[PDB]
Amino acid sequence: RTNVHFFRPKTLVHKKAPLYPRNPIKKGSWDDPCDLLRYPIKTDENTTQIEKNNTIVFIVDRRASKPEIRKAFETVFETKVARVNTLITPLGLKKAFIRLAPDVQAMDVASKMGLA
Amino acid sequence: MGAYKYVQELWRKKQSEALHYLFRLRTWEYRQLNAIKRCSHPTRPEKARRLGYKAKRGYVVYRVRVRRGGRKRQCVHGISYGKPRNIGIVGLKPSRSLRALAEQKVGRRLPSLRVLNSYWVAQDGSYKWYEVILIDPFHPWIRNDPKINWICNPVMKRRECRGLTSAGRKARGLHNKGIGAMKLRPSKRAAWKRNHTRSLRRYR
């Protein structure tokens, strides 16, 4: 014997196997495109944002991160995002600054949506 | 006749050489274990049956160790204030016996079981050991058996917390009847409240 200490013997360990499912029906959550995005914020400061800087400002659900925002906007408006900045306003809402890819016109995308 | 008549006769000779040796080996061992411990089988099978044990699925036995001697009050610096009749600190005696305290300790540790009864197994200068019988009341062997399924009904929860076991009954005075016992039968509080009531009838 090499070690002077007594350790617990190695014994088989099983995986779990519940006899009935604890969640028989898979329900939805807060996140899904068209629910994570709420509406755009329309101001003259924010119109300048689109004509130059190619950027659209949106209100989104507070629980969404930057990677969930990029994917949602790409699937709903069929376009290409480049970078997303975010903040939580003094009232509790989440604002996203969404910059489109350098070969897309956010005027063409804000116009089809109604933002103009 | 059977064998348990001899075992009962033997246990009435605790001073004998034989039982003095066996009582010595048990106290050395119990001193090497924890205060509350599960037992595989009863250490005294004949006394266990006298108190209601049955070798079926749903009956369990635990050994409980409690400490010997009197009671000391919880008063900071050993100071009672107030009237001089109330000044004593050391030399007091607990109101419940040590057998009853053993059942209450194991009821608190295992609150999903039902305490049935208890009996003595050993003692030395610092400790006494008791064994407690407990029933699991949701086992099907227990529930479907008319002999024991009185304890599956919910007025039997935490019996030892309410003074309903045999040792708890003795401290309330309930092993007596007649002269000397007329002021305790429902409860000591209940007889006081009945005897001190002003009943103002309509046609007084």
Partner: protein, 116 residues
């Protein structure tokens, strides 16, 4: 106005999943118009009519997937209070020992009349 709950009964899962996709997207359009009116009320509750049905068809399917099992999911178990689940059965409460019973069959219950 808007969708009746009865007229989505009989529709397939795909025809209900596909119908929910347009309702979600339409509320994005209508929230965008609000922030940049009678229809927007009816659309919120069209979404609720459909999700009501998608869940009601899924519960009746699963509650037959387990109809004859020993262990059932806890959502599909009877509706009882915590105290009722823990009570003895009336048969269990009426059980008597063997000797006690064989004495109740001897000496039955009898009707009789006494006179003044």
């Amino acid at each position: 106005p808007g969708l009746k709950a009865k007229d989505l009964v009989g529709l397939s899962q795909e025809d209900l999943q596909r119908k929910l996709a347009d309702l979600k997207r339409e509320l994005l359009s209508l929230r965008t118009m609000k922030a940049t009116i009678a229809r927007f009320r009816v659309c919120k509750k069209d979404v609720a009519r459909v999700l009501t049905v998608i869940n009601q068809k899924a519960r009746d399917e699963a509650r037959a997937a387990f109809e004859g099992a020993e262990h059932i999911p806890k959502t599909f178990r009877p509706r009882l209070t915590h105290a009722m689940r823990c009570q003895l059965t009336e048969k269990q409460k009426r059980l008597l020992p063997s000797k006690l019973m064989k004495r109740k069959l001897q000496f039955p219950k009898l009707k009789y009349a006494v006179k003044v």
